[PDB]
């Protein structure tokens, strides 16, 4: 037991992301409201947050942990927009190399499509931390 579990390549660190919530975010209806959701993907595993309805700012305030196998690696997250049977649309998007991550601070992200060159609505809060093994 005390022994370790030496054999498989020892990762750079862990990158941890923290889902604080969404301001100005795209109404997909004419009502005013959507289904929106954030999805976190990096390196191979993926994990989403808890999709609410009837409401345009979702309070998610999660976290998700996920091994550092690159230290050249981008996380990236994609809100999209869940449509009954209808599949999600993309409602903008956010790159940041882990590199940049330098403090938990709360770093607001514009949410900019395939286009980075220019913006497309609203921006989003995403607090992430850089961990070292």
């Not at 889902?19 to 409201?33: H, I, R, W």
């Not at 601070?105 to 931390?129: H, R, S, T, W």
Request: glycine share 8%; charged share 25%.
């Amino acid at each position: 037991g005390s022994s370790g579990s030496s054999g498989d390549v020892k990762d750079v660190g862990i990158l941890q992301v923290k889902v604080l919530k969404a301001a100005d975010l795209l109404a997909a209806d004419f009502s005013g409201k959507s289904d929106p959701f954030c999805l976190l993907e990096l390196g191979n595993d993926r994990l989403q947050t808890h999709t609410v309805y009837k409401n345009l700012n979702p309070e998610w305030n999660k976290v998700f942990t996920f091994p550092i196998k690159d230290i050249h690696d981008v996380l990236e997250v994609t809100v999209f927009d869940e449509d009954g049977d209808k599949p999600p649309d993309f409602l903008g998007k956010v790159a940041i190399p882990l590199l940049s991550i330098r403090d938990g601070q709360p770093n607001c992200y514009v949410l900019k499509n395939k286009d980075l060159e220019q913006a497309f609505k609203g921006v989003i809060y995403l607090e992430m931390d850089l961990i070292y093994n």
